[PDB]
Design a protein around this ligand. Structure first.
Ligand SMILES: [Mg+2]
Ligand SMILES: [Mg+2]
Ligand SMILES: [Mg+2]
Ligand SMILES: [Mg+2]
Ligand SMILES: [Mg+2]
Ligand SMILES: [Mg+2]
Ligand SMILES: [Mg+2]
Ligand SMILES: [Mg+2]
Ligand SMILES: [Mg+2]
Ligand SMILES: [Mg+2]
Ligand SMILES: [Mg+2]
Ligand SMILES: [Mg+2]
Ligand SMILES: [Mg+2]
Ligand SMILES: [Mg+2]
Ligand SMILES: [Mg+2]
Ligand SMILES: [Mg+2]
Ligand SMILES: [Mg+2]
Ligand SMILES: [Mg+2]
Ligand SMILES: [Mg+2]
Ligand SMILES: [Mg+2]
Ligand SMILES: [Mg+2]
Ligand SMILES: [Mg+2]
Ligand SMILES: [Mg+2]
Ligand SMILES: [Mg+2]
Ligand SMILES: [Mg+2]
Ligand SMILES: [Mg+2]
Ligand SMILES: [Mg+2]
Ligand SMILES: [Mg+2]
Ligand SMILES: [Mg+2]
Ligand SMILES: [Mg+2]
Ligand SMILES: [Mg+2]
Ligand SMILES: [Mg+2]
Ligand SMILES: [Mg+2]
Ligand SMILES: [Mg+2]
Ligand SMILES: [Mg+2]
Ligand SMILES: [Mg+2]
Ligand SMILES: [Mg+2]
Ligand SMILES: [Mg+2]
Ligand SMILES: [Mg+2]
Ligand SMILES: [Mg+2]
Ligand SMILES: [Mg+2]
Ligand SMILES: [Mg+2]
Ligand SMILES: [Mg+2]
Ligand SMILES: [Mg+2]
Ligand SMILES: [Mg+2]
Ligand SMILES: [Mg+2]
Ligand SMILES: [Mg+2]
Ligand SMILES: [Mg+2]
Ligand SMILES: [Mg+2]
Ligand SMILES: [Mg+2]
Ligand SMILES: [Mg+2]
Ligand SMILES: [Mg+2]
Ligand SMILES: [Mg+2]
Ligand SMILES: [Mg+2]
Ligand SMILES: [Mg+2]
Ligand SMILES: [Mg+2]
Ligand SMILES: [Mg+2]
Ligand SMILES: [Mg+2]
Ligand SMILES: [Mg+2]
Ligand SMILES: [Mg+2]
Ligand SMILES: [Mg+2]
Ligand SMILES: [Mg+2]
Ligand SMILES: [Mg+2]
Ligand SMILES: [Mg+2]
Ligand SMILES: [Mg+2]
Ligand SMILES: [Mg+2]
Ligand SMILES: [Mg+2]
Ligand SMILES: [Mg+2]
Ligand SMILES: [Mg+2]
Ligand SMILES: [Mg+2]
Ligand SMILES: [Mg+2]
Ligand SMILES: [Mg+2]
Ligand SMILES: [Mg+2]
Ligand SMILES: [Mg+2]
Ligand SMILES: [Mg+2]
Ligand SMILES: [Mg+2]
Ligand SMILES: [Mg+2]
Ligand SMILES: [Mg+2]
Ligand SMILES: [Mg+2]
Ligand SMILES: [Mg+2]
Ligand SMILES: [Mg+2]
Ligand SMILES: [Mg+2]
Ligand SMILES: [Mg+2]
Ligand SMILES: [Mg+2]
Ligand SMILES: [Mg+2]
Ligand SMILES: [Mg+2]
Ligand SMILES: [Mg+2]
Ligand SMILES: [Mg+2]
Ligand SMILES: [Mg+2]
Ligand SMILES: [Mg+2]
Ligand SMILES: [Mg+2]
Ligand SMILES: [Mg+2]
Ligand SMILES: [Mg+2]
Ligand SMILES: [Mg+2]
Ligand SMILES: [Mg+2]
Ligand SMILES: [Mg+2]
Ligand SMILES: [Mg+2]
Ligand SMILES: [Mg+2]
Ligand SMILES: [Mg+2]
Ligand SMILES: [Mg+2]
Ligand SMILES: [Mg+2]
Ligand SMILES: [Mg+2]
Ligand SMILES: [Mg+2]
Ligand SMILES: [Mg+2]
Ligand SMILES: [Mg+2]
Lengths: 10, 77, 46
RNA sequence: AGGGGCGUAGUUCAAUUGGUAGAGCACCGGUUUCCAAAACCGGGUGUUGGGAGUUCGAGUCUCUCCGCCCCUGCCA
RNA sequence: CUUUAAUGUUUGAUGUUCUAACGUUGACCCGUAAUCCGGGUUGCGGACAGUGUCUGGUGGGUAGUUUGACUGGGGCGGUCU
RNA sequence: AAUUCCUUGUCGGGUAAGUUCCGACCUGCACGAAUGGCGUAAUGAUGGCCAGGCUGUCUCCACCCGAGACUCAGUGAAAUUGAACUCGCUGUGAAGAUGCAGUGUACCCGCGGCAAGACGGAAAGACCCCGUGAACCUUUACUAUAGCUUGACACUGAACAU
RNA sequence: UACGGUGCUGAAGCAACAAAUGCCCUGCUUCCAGGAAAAGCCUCUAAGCAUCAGGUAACAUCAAAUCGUACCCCAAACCGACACAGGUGGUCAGGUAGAGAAUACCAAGGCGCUUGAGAGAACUCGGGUGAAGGAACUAGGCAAAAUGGUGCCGUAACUUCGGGAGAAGGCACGCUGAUAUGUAGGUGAGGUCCCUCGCGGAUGGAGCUGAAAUCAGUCGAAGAUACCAGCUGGCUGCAACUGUUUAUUAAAAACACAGCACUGUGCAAACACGAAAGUGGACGUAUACGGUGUGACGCCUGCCCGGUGCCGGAAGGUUAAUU
RNA sequence: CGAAGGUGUGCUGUGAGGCAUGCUGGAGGUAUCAGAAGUGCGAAUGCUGACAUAAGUAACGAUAAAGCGGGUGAAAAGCCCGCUCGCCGGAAGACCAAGGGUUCCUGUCCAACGUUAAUCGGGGCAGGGUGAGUCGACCCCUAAGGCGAGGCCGAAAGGCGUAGUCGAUGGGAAACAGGUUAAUAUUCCUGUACUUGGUGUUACUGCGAAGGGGGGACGGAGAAGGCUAUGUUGGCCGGGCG
RNA sequence: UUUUGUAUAAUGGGUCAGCGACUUAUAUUCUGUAGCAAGGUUAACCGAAUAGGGGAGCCGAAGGGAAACCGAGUCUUAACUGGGCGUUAAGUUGCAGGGUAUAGACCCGAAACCCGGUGAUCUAGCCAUGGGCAGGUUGAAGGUUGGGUAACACUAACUGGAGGACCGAACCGACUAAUGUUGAAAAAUUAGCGGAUGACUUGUGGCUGGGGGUGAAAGGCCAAUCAAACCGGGAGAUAGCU
RNA sequence: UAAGGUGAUAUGAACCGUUAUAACCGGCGAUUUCCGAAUGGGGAAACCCAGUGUGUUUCGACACACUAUCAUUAACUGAAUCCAUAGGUUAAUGAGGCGAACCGGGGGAACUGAAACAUCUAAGUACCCCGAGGAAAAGAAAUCAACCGAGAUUCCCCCAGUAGCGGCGAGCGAACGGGGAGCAGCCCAGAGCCUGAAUCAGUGUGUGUGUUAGUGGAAGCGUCUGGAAAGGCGCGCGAUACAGGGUGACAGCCCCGUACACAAAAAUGCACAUGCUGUGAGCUCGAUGAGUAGGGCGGGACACGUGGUAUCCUGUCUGAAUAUGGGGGGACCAUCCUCCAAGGCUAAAUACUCCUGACUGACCGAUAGUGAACCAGUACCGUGAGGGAAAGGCGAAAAGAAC
C-alpha cells in the first residue's frame, strides 16, 4: 500500500 | 417469561402507526399479574402468574377446574 | 517493534480451543460449518 | 465594486403612503425674579436631498443623479 | 313554560378510617452447610404505588431521508408562468 | 493584544539601518469579567525578541581520515515499457514537436558524470465542478421513535363523611 | 596412548582487611493514600464412639505415581514474509579508575557481524583540523562549536519566603617528600583482669585498612589533562505546576489538574448498563454521590429575565383517550 | 501406403477463405444438405501462465578487523588445527520462564536452501540423545473472573445468579556436593541427608465435625546495625632466575 | 477510445498463448415462412407415450356507449339534414427473426445499507496477583537540648527523613537534526532530548464487542484496517458515470 | 467362490494355498483404545482426579461393575406447622446430540424499484430460533353457489394479468366457474339394548414378490501391409447376444460382458393369507363444544394499503343466543337460500435428495468441468471466524538404458 503523497496542489 | 399460566397468552408483535402511516415494529404484552389464589380443597394459597383476562375465567370456570387442566398441561404450578 | 502476535498457549486454547468453541451453540455452528467443509483440523487444539 | 436603507422645521424624530406634514428641544414675545435661570402664558418656522417622469394632482408613485448609512466582494 | 323549594335516583368530586388484593431491596422461622430464591410468622405501607391496553405532551436520546435548476466554473445575486 | 481591517497606526527604547520585540498612546474595524477579567513567584524538549561566550552557519571554502561511488571476479533485482532507424532551429499543428514543413548540423559504438526535455516515473486528482452518488455530524428541516410524562380502563376492595 | 585421553599420585588448602542492591528484615522507625483470600498447620469442643475405634510416642517396613527434562531463549531456532541494524520477562553481577549497574581498559567467557580483491576521480555519507573575521548565514544561532568535575569563596531583581540558585563569577587540583618512614580515623589480635561461666564482659593495643589538610620540592604549553561531564544572562506572550494526547508528519497555548461555583440526588437515591430480572452507584447516606462549567494562588467577578431554557404557581382560556 | 495437429510451399476466390503438397507427428478424421451454439478478440490500468526490458546496472544487510602457517579436499579469502591481531565483557557472557519443536550429538552428501565459493551449516540423509520421593507440572488452596443444580427473568435463543465448581500471575512436605557422556543431569554414579503418607509391632492413652478459635496474614517510605556472597593483601605451597 | 477537433505532449496496452462481453425463460407485438381457413388451435392430463385422446379454454368472424342497453349500426341530444366511433377489406396455429416486458438481462467496477458471526495474544481503560526503579543531592513536619515567656508564642543548635522535590543509568517516553524513502527495518538507526518513588513502569491472567466498546478527549484506539472493525450472507445491491 | 493369494505408493522378504478351513465376496455375530450429547468429578478435546460395590493376594496392590442431568411414574422419608405441603433419598422408564434440502411455527431486514424520497415495493424474501416426518402441512363445511345446484383437503391447467388493490404512482393481484391428478371418511362431548361382531394396532405362521453374495451364457479361419491386425483382400458362422469395455492400429464370433435362462444357508423389505394379544361393530333414546360468538380500542392476515370494507387471527376492555337457536351470502336492513363454530383423527394425489443402484446427454475435456481428474478443503494465508491454490498424458510391454 502507500499513503497519498501530500504533494497536493490545492 | 411473560406467559399466562391459565390462558397461555404470550407477547405478540405489531406496528406503531402515525398520521403518515409510518410503521415501526412493536410488541404487545399481556396484562400479567402475580396473584395468590385460594384453593379450597387444599385449604392453601397457590400463586399464579395470570393475565387480567385469565382472572375473569377463573371465577367462571372455578379454581379447581382450571388447575385440573393445568395438571394435564404439565405447567408445574 | 512489538507486533500484533504474542504467542500464549494458555490464552490460545482458552479463546479458540475445542471446549471454548463447543461451549456455545454459535461456536458449535463453527464446528458444524468446518465439519461440513471437511476441514482437516476442526479446532485450534493440538 | 455589488446590494439594501436613509435625506421632513435650527437639531433629534413622527408621518399621511395620491388630494391640507406633525411631536420634543431649541428660537422669539409676554409674565414671574433685585437679576439670570427654573417655571407660566402665547407664537412663527419645511423647495420634505437634486432632477426627470406619472397623475387632473406627488414630499408620498417610478427612474436616474448627489450625499449619508448597512451589508456582501467567497472556493482553488 | 319559567322560577324552581324540597323529594328519591343515577353518576361523579374530594376527605376520613379500615384490610383483604398488592408492595416490602423491615424483622424472624424453615427449605439450608446458602446475604439467591421460595414458603411461613410478623411489622410497615395500601387501594396508592407499580404494571398492561389506549391516550395527550415532551423527546437529535436514536433512526430514515430531504435540502431544485438555469448560470461565460460554482457560490452569492438574479431568474422560473 | 494569541484579538487592530485601514496598518509597517503614532511616540519612545534597542540597531548603522528594527514591517519583529519592549514601553506607552486609545482611534477596542470586531477586549471584558467563571464560554471568567487582570496580575502572578516557580515551572516549560512553550512562542517571540535581545546580549555575552562560542564556533566552517557564513565571507569562502581547503586539506585529511573512513564508508560508498569507479575497476576486476561471483551472485544477481526493481518500478517502467505501442513500436522506433529516438538531432538543432524557425514555423505549423487537440493551440509548448525526436517523428509535420523548411533549414542547419551530425562518422559507427561504449564508459564515467550532470539532470534541461521526453507535458519523465509513482497513484482512474484530494483543489474545482457534476451525479435527483455515499457516509458521519448539527439543528426551532420533515416524519417517526426509545425514554420521560398525563389521563381513562384493567390488576383494584369495604365503610363513612360531606 | 588415537593431538583427545586413561591410570596412579598429589603440596598448601590460612589470616587480615574491604564489602553489597543479597541475608538478619514477613524486622525496626515513621507516614497516610490505611495496605488479599483460602487451605495445609495448631487448638477447642458438638453428634457419634468411649472394652472398640481413634489419638500420642518409639521402632520396622512399604510407597512417593503420572507428565515435563535435548536445544534456542535480547535471538540465524521466539514475534517481525528474510539466517531481517527492530521487539521480547526473570536470574547471575569479576579487576583498575570512578559516587555509580555511568564511562574507559581488561578477566571468566564469547565473538570478528556469509561476498571479496583492487583503485585512492567527481559527488554523497560518517568524521578530523583550519589563517582572518565571528551570525555578516538563515524563516530561525537549524546544526556544529562551546560549557561540563569536586572543594571553597561568592551570588541580583523578584518571591507564594519554599525559592530564584549549580544564579552569575572566581580560586585550588599532577607527581615527590615532610608534617606523619604508612597521619587523623576505622578495624582490632595477643596479653591482663572479671564472670552466677559463654558464640561472655571490661581492659588492652599489636597487626591491617586509611582519607583529608598544610608545607617543601619537581615536570609539562597544558595536572577536573582521556572517556565521562550544565552554555549563560535580559525582556515578554500563553498555560499555574508534575502529568496526558493525535501508535505511523502536530507534545502545544490543546486535555487533565487541585481549587471554585451552580444544579440534581433522602437511599427500593438520582443516574447508568440492561425488553426484564438484576448489577454498578455503594456494602457509601448530603462533611455523600452524580452532572455541568471554570481551572493553583492573589485582587475581583458589574448590568439585563425581553428571547430561549429551567423552576414555581393554578384561577381562567384551550385540549386526548373515555362516555 | 500416414487422420487431426503443427510447420513450409504452391494454386485459387470480391472477401471472410478454399484446394493441394513437402516436412513433423503417429490415430483418428469426416463429404453433402440440414440442426444447435460456451460461434470468431488487440485493446477493457482485462484474468492466468510464460518470457522480455531496465541489466550484468543497483544491491550482496551495521565502518567490531583481520593476518599467516598447516590440514582435509577435485578445488580453500570463507572449513579444521595452530600462532598472532581485533571486538563485547550490566554483554555481543552465563542460567531460565514464555515461545519454538529436534534446530541438540554423530556419520554422510553438496542438486536446491546460505544474497559469493563452500569440503562447512540452524541445508539434504541416516543413527543416537531428554533417566527425578526432593527441580517443575500434575496435586491441595484460594484472587480477579468464568461456569453454574435449583431459582429469578426473558418471543424462542437466552440473561443474571445461589448452593456449588473451576480458575495462578499468589499460599501449601522434603537434597546437597563431587564425578561422569559426542550429545543429559539437584534426574545418572559416588558420598552424606531429608520429607509426606501406608502397614505392622510396642507402650501410653479422649477421640471426634460440613462447626469454633488461633495461625497462615501481607502497605509505602526511611534509617542504621549485625552479617555473608565476593574482592584485595599478607601468609603458606609449588614453580620461575628471565 | 473519447471528441467540434488528436502525430498529438489526451486514455489504454512490455510481449506471446489461453480465457474474456447482447444470452436464457416467459409473455406480447411486427416481419418472413408453412399449414388450415370463417374459422384456427388445444393446455394440464390420459396414453406404449414425439402417435392418439383431451376443444377445458384462447383468438377471430360486430360494433357503439360510462353503463343499462341497442345493434350494421350505435353514441351524442328533446331531436339531429348532423357529428364521433363502426359497417366492402381473413384470420389463426406453428417455425425463424426484429422490438417490447419481467427476471442480474451485453460484460467488468463502486463508496455504502442491512443481517448473523469472529476479534481487547495489538492497543485503550479497568480488575486480581507479582516484579522493577544504579548512584549522588536538597534537608519539611516532628523530636531533643538550650535560649527566651508567668505559661506560651518565638529563637538557636542537634537530631530527624518529608516531596506527583533535584542531578543522573536501568526502565519508559519520543522534542530537534542528519541518514534512510525499491529501508538493516510497511515508522527505524546515529548524535543529542524529557520523565526517571510515581497521576510511575512492567510480567502473568481476567473483563468491557461494532452504532457498540474504550478514550487525562486526538474523532484517538478497538489485531499493519476506524467519522462506525473484521468474516460470511442478502449479493450478480445499485452505478442516468467511465 | 476358489487356483492362486498376503490393501496402495511398492518392490522385496518370509510365507499361505491349489478341489476345498488359501485368498476374495455376502449374511449373521464377537471385539470395538481415547476424545466427542460424553453422562463419576474436573478440564487448555483426545488429558487430570475420584467414589461405591463385587471379585481377586504374592499384603505392594489388582480386575470388573456402578456413580451426569432433565422429564414422567411409583415407593420411602420429610420442614417452618398439628395434620399436610414444599423439600429430600432411592427405583424404573424416556429425552439429550448429529445430519443436505424439503415442511410447520416463533421472530424478521436493508440494499433496490418508485429514475429523489416517507405510504408502498423489495418481502414475510435473506437471516435467526423452535419442532417434526419420509413426506410435512392441510383436511370431512357454522363451505360455496344463486332460487338451479355443488358436496373434505392437497396438486396441475384455465378462468386472468380479468375483478379489484395502489403517493390509484411504482407495483401488487384474485375468486367464482371449468378441465385434470387423486379421492375416505370418522371419533368425543352418554346411557342403554345387544355383544367382541367390523376395524385397527401389536405379534408369531406360511405363501408370494423383492433386497443383501452369485451361475451359465452363442458364433473365424486364410492371406496382405505392418513392430504388433481387431485394418486390407477372401471365404464363413452366431444373433431373444451388432449394449458397451478390453486386447500391440477400427473385433458380432480374442477377453470381460450383453440378450436370455437360473441361484440364497442367513438377514431383511413388501404384499396376501392365517393364528394369538389388545381394539370395539350394530340398534334405540339422549346430548349438540360460553368468557365463546359478537362488540369497543390497537394491530395483523385475507389480491384488498381504513377505505363505504365484508371475512379471518387477537394485545386490550366487554360480552350473547344456545335448535322454539345461531353462522354466512363483501357496508347495512328485510326476504330467501345454505350451513351448524367455539372438541378431535385421517391414506392418496404434493415438495425435496446428504445417500444407494442403473441408465441418459447436439454437457465439459485439464486456464474447461466440482475449489479439488493428482494424498484438496490439502499446501498456504489469517489471533480467529474464514479465505484458499498450483499440479493430468514415457512406451504395446520398463523391456526405465548392462557395459
Ligand atoms: Mg475549501
Ligand atoms: Mg439525524
Ligand atoms: Mg433508503
Ligand atoms: Mg446547478
Ligand atoms: Mg497586523
Ligand atoms: Mg519606532
Ligand atoms: Mg505593546
Ligand atoms: Mg472574550
Ligand atoms: Mg457575570
Ligand atoms: Mg460565564
Ligand atoms: Mg518562553
Ligand atoms: Mg553570543
Ligand atoms: Mg527521443
Ligand atoms: Mg514549436
Ligand atoms: Mg526542440
Ligand atoms: Mg551512461
Ligand atoms: Mg547529479
Ligand atoms: Mg540530479
Ligand atoms: Mg508524470
Ligand atoms: Mg479523477
Ligand atoms: Mg476524486
Ligand atoms: Mg444537482
Ligand atoms: Mg510501616
Ligand atoms: Mg537477532
Ligand atoms: Mg515486514
Ligand atoms: Mg521469520
Ligand atoms: Mg524489553
Ligand atoms: Mg558501559
Ligand atoms: Mg574493549
Ligand atoms: Mg576517500
Ligand atoms: Mg550536505
Ligand atoms: Mg571539529
Ligand atoms: Mg593533524
Ligand atoms: Mg577559523
Ligand atoms: Mg584563529
Ligand atoms: Mg542577519
Ligand atoms: Mg542574507
Ligand atoms: Mg540550536
Ligand atoms: Mg561537540
Ligand atoms: Mg535563574
Ligand atoms: Mg507580542
Ligand atoms: Mg502546561
Ligand atoms: Mg511537562
Ligand atoms: Mg504522530
Ligand atoms: Mg503514547
Ligand atoms: Mg511529534
Ligand atoms: Mg479551561
Ligand atoms: Mg421575565
Ligand atoms: Mg426567562
Ligand atoms: Mg476434433
Ligand atoms: Mg503441407
Ligand atoms: Mg502409437
Ligand atoms: Mg465465447
Ligand atoms: Mg520483470
Ligand atoms: Mg559486474
Ligand atoms: Mg545504466
Ligand atoms: Mg554503476
Ligand atoms: Mg555498486
Ligand atoms: Mg554481512
Ligand atoms: Mg586458510
Ligand atoms: Mg531438521
Ligand atoms: Mg549442530
Ligand atoms: Mg557445485
Ligand atoms: Mg542439518
Ligand atoms: Mg532419580
Ligand atoms: Mg520423569
Ligand atoms: Mg519443590
Ligand atoms: Mg438452571
Ligand atoms: Mg452465572
Ligand atoms: Mg482447582
Ligand atoms: Mg504459580
Ligand atoms: Mg547442553
Ligand atoms: Mg540442559
Ligand atoms: Mg568471606
Ligand atoms: Mg490530423
Ligand atoms: Mg502519447
Ligand atoms: Mg500504461
Ligand atoms: Mg408466420
Ligand atoms: Mg399430441
Ligand atoms: Mg368450448
Ligand atoms: Mg352514425
Ligand atoms: Mg423475437
Ligand atoms: Mg437484453
Ligand atoms: Mg519528580
Ligand atoms: Mg533525570
Ligand atoms: Mg523536571
Ligand atoms: Mg490500526
Ligand atoms: Mg454504518
Ligand atoms: Mg461482508
Ligand atoms: Mg436482493
Ligand atoms: Mg455489481
Ligand atoms: Mg467423565
Ligand atoms: Mg429510489
Ligand atoms: Mg422414518
Ligand atoms: Mg459366467
Ligand atoms: Mg358443537
Ligand atoms: Mg369479543
Ligand atoms: Mg381490528
Ligand atoms: Mg370514501
Ligand atoms: Mg385511499
Ligand atoms: Mg373490512
Ligand atoms: Mg493439454
Ligand atoms: Mg472452470
Ligand atoms: Mg482446476
Ligand atoms: Mg498447467
Amino acid at each position: 500500500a502507500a499513503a497519498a503523497v501530500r504533494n497536493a496542489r490545492w | 417469561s411473560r406467559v399466562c399460566q391459565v390462558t397461555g397468552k404470550r407477547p405478540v408483535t405489531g406496528n406503531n402507526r402515525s398520521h403518515a402511516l409510518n410503521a415501526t415494529k412493536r410488541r404487545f404484552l399481556p396484562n400479567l399479574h402475580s396473584h395468590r389464589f385460594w384453593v379450597e380443597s387444599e385449604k392453601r394459597f397457590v400463586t399464579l402468574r395470570v393475565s387480567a383476562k385469565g382472572m375473569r375465567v377463573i371465577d367462571k370456570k372455578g379454581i379447581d377446574t382450571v388447575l385440573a387442566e393445568l395438571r394435564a398441561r404439565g405447567e408445574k404450578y | 517493534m512489538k507486533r500484533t502476535f504474542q504467542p500464549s498457549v494458555l490464552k490460545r486454547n482458552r479463546s479458540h480451543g475445542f471446549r471454548a468453541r463447543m461451549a456455545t451453540k454459535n461456536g458449535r455452528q463453527v464446528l458444524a460449518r468446518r465439519r461440513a467443509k471437511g476441514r482437516a483440523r476442526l479446532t485450534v487444539s493440538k
